Amino acid sequence: VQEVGWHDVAGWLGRGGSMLGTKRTLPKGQLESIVENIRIYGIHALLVVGGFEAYEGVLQLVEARGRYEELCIVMCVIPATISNNVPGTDFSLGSDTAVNAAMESCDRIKQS
Amino acid sequence: GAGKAIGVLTSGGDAQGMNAAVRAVTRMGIYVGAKVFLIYEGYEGLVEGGENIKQANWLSVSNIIQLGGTIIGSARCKAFTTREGRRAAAYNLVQHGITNLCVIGGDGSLTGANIFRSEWGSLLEELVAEGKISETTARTYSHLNIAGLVGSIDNDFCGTDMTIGTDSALHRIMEVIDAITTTAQSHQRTFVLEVMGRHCGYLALVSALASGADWLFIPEAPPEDGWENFMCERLGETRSRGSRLNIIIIAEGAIDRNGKPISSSYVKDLVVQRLGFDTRVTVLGHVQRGGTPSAFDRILSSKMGMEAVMALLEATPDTPACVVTLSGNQSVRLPLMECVQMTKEVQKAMDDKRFDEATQLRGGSFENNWNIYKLLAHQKPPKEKSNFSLAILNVGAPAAGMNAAVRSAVRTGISHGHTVYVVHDGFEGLAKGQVQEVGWHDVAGWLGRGGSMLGTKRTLPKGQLESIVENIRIYGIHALLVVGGFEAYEGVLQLVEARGRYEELCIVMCVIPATISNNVPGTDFSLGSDTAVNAAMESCDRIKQSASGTKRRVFIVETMGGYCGYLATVTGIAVGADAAYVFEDPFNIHDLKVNVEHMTEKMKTDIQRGLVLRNEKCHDYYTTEFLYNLYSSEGKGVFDCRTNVLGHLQQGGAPTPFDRNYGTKLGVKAMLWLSEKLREVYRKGRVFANAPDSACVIGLKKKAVAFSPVTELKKDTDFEHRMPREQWWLSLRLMLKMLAQ
Amino acid sequence: FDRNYGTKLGVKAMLWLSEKLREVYRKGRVFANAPDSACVIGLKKKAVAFSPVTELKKDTDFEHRMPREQWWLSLRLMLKMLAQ
Numbered sequence A: 001v002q003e004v005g006w007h008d009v010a011g012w013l014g015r016g017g018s019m020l021g022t023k024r025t026l027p028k029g030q031l032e033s034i035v036e037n038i039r040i041y042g043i044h045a046l047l048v049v050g051g052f053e054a055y056e057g058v059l060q061l062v063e064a065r066g067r068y069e070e071l072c073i074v075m076c077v078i079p080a081t082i083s084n085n086v087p088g089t090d091f092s093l094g095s096d097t098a099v100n101a102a103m104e105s106c107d108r109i110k111q112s
Numbered sequence B: 001g002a003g004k005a006i007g008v009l010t011s012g013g014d015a016q017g018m019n020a021a022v023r024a025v026t027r028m029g030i031y032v033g034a035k036v037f038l039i040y041e042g043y044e045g046l047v048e049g050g051e052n053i054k055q056a057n058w059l060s061v062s063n064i065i066q067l068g069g070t071i072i073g074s075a076r077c078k079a080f081t082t083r084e085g086r087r088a089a090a091y092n093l094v095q096h097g098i099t100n101l102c103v104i105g106g107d108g109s110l111t112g113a114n115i116f117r118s119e120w121g122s123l124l125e126e127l128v129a130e131g132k133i134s135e136t137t138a139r140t141y142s143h144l145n146i147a148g149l150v151g152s153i154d155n156d157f158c159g160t161d162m163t164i165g166t167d168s169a170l171h172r173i174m175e176v177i178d179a180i181t182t183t184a185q186s187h188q189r190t191f192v193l194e195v196m197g198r199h200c201g202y203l204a205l206v207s208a209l210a211s212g213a214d215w216l217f218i219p220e221a222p223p224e225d226g227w228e229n230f231m232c233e234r235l236g237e238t239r240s241r242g243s244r245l246n247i248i249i250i251a252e253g254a255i256d257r258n259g260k261p262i263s264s265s266y267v268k269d270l271v272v273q274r275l276g277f278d279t280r281v282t283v284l285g286h287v288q289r290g291g292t293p294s295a296f297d298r299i300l301s302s303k304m305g306m307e308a309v310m311a312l313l314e315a316t317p318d319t320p321a322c323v324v325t326l327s328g329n330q331s332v333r334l335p336l337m338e339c340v341q342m343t344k345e346v347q348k349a350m351d352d353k354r355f356d357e358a359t360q361l362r363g364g365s366f367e368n369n370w371n372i373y374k375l376l377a378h379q380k381p382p383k384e385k386s387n388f389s390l391a392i393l394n395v396g397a398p399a400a401g402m403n404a405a406v407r408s409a410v411r412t413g414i415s416h417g418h419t420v421y422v423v424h425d426g427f428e429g430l431a432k433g434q435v436q437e438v439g440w441h442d443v444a445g446w447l448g449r450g451g452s453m454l455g456t457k458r459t460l461p462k463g464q465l466e467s468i469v470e471n472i473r474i475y476g477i478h479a480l481l482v483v484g485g486f487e488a489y490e491g492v493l494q495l496v497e498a499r500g501r502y503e504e505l506c507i508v509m510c511v512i513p514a515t516i517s518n519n520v521p522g523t524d525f526s527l528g529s530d531t532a533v534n535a536a537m538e539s540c541d542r543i544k545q546s547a548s549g550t551k552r553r554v555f556i557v558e559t560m561g562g563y564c565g566y567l568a569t570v571t572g573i574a575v576g577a578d579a580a581y582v583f584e585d586p587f588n589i590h591d592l593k594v595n596v597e598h599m600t601e602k603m604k605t606d607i608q609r610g611l612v613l614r615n616e617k618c619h620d621y622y623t624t625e626f627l628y629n630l631y632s633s634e635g636k637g638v639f640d641c642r643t644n645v646l647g648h649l650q651q652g653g654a655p656t657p658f659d660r661n662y663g664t665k666l667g668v669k670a671m672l673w674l675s676e677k678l679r680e681v682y683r684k685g686r687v688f689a690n691a692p693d694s695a696c697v698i699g700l701k702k703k704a705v706a707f708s709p710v711t712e713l714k715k716d717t718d719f720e721h722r723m724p725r726e727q728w729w730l731s732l733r734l735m736l737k738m739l740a741q
Numbered sequence C: 001f002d003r004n005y006g007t008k009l010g011v012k013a014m015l016w017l018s019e020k021l022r023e024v025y026r027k028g029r030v031f032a033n034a035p036d037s038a039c040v041i042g043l044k045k046k047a048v049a050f051s052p053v054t055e056l057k058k059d060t061d062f063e064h065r066m067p068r069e070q071w072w073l074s075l076r077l078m079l080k081m082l083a084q
Ligand SMILES: Nc1ncnc2c1ncn2[C@@H]1O[C@H](COP(=O)(O)OP(=O)(O)O)[C@@H](O)[C@H]1O
Pocket: B011, B012, B013, B043, B076, B077, B078, B080, B081, B105, B106, B107, B108, B109, B110, B111, B112, B113, B115
């Protein structure tokens, strides 16, 4: 974990993929370590932008509140995955680029 | 569904409750279409035969249910032991055409009955051989079927949870001991009471537990060597440290480690010699075998007699002899020889000094009760000194036995080293502070006081939830043992839903259901309903006596109980009411017309009286005034009617021994569970209980305790009518209806 | 061996089952709660033994469905040495 400033994220608008890096890991395997990092840094909100595994992970943190104390923390998901499969959203962030790439690939195949 | 005959007889040691069993057996047997014979004197009249036996109708067993003992004698017999008496009895039964025989009595009568069944065929062969009876009659009556009821106050029969008449004997013991405790406290006299109990100390343990007696003698746990010094240590410790009175219970079958009997006279001589405390000795004698049977004995005996007749009807010759008993709180049916031999093996192993083997053979419930009483009796020095905190509240209406549960909760909490607080006036008081610490001696002697000493209210928390949060923070409470009624359950539910926005309410909560209506969910018998049923029983008995005096009269009794009709149903069974209108059984004008018609027909017979109950809110429109007008109008010319409202008499006076013991048991058990959760969720030196498992209702399920969580139960309650979705006791309404013509 | 082993296990398992079933019958109803009421008949190193089913749980790999330790691991040295 590291603090971020205003200039630290300038120019990242036009870069594909993810700059911070992403994973398919789920919290409940390492939930104790997540609790330790939330306490040491004293975090008070998680804006978990991601795909389906983001939704499932936030669900696990919600039900993890029953025993753990510092997971009483505001959480906000942002659905971003090409498949457009997170619930509660019609268009997920980043599916349009995927449809366009599929469109261009199929156009080239159709020409062949 | 029957075209055969039944025989009913009581034998062995008499115990109040027999008359109710005979009434239920007779009326059920007639209701199915069989022929019932009343065998006076038990086995003696059975052998004698002739006039001692007579066929009975619906009215032969009327106006006896409220009497103790038996009306048909139960005289002990000897000739039935010899085969000459058994063949004479078989001749009498065949001459009356009895092929099914329900025997009520102890283990010895059942043993003799089972032997008589085992040789029935040979006896009929002998009777045909001598020419007394024809072969065709012997072929018609070729088999005998048996159903046994354990009528005893000692409660030693191993196959049964509760034997017929033991609870009423505990009532007689409690009447006597409450009388003694007055003079004992007055003159600082240590008393010695000698209860009954052949070779089972169940009556002694239950009386001691329900009375807070300072020492007990029972054969299941004989006192260790040199127990006299331990007597001196305990009695000196209590009497020096505030104990005005002291009570010593002694079963008549008490023994030592060497099996030698310990005389009550030895107890008196020891206490006088070693301490010089002014003291006396008393033997309750045969008072415990008589009196008006308690409501539990009437209801139980009626149900068990019904089930016994059902067993006789559906039994076959290949089926062995069976006894109808209680497991948990239902009517199971067990084979006879297994329970008899189990009882002989236990009693013999006790005689053989294999005390531990007898302890496991009897059942763990006895040992758990013995351990609970030992813990609660005298103060052991605590050592843990935990950091937790407790606030025990009384919520709802006052109900007999709530003081007992609060007493056990405090003392069990102290034994675990908590810092228990008592909050007066429920959630209303907790909002206004009114919190004080409690010590061990602060709650002594509250076992035998009815109502609630701390005070109770119907207030719910959500109106003053902010003030509750302030008081939880300032006192730093870490658990709430909310003993109370339905409003307790709803209040704890509000605190659960309030956890989402308040950090202070992340607190373990344990409900204890205590309210007369028996309407909290997740519990079968709520603490303090038994005293209410008994008070309703006594009130209706007095009204029934008044009605029988002025012939041709009916009474409309409006019992309490909220929307739940447990109280109206069970008291109707316990007093033989003509009906008990209840919300759970919707009725229209046609049912009331039918009930009036039953009353019109019944008024032609000898029993020119009636009684119909009504829960206070069993119907939106049909008020008690409406029923009074209907019965009087349509019953014009044959009888008149009067109305009564058993108001807060239902809450009863002193708590009955069952409610006293049950409160003590729920207090200790809820405290052990609470001290389990309360440390299982300990983290960062603080408690954080937020899962739904942390808010429960300790309740007596079918077999034993179960801790159902509040949120799961939320789907099994009707908040509008304030009662659970499904109650277990609806089957009893069938018995109530069948026992009326 | 499989016919003999099947026959011998069937007899001995049935005998143990009848023994315990007669042991736990009391007061007219069967009631089997202790862990010894559920076991696996198996030929141990020497002869037959009845291991409680729950007690074996600490020596079972439910991920891969096999015991933690197996006796036949010594045979792998046999296989490798007998080959060049
Ligand atoms: N070995 C037996 N055979 C036949 N009947 C017996 C036997 N033992 C006891 N009884 C019966 O028990 C009756 C009364 O004896 P008792 O033991 O005092 O009654 P209870 O059943 O209450 O223990 C006797 O009349 C007898 O019929």
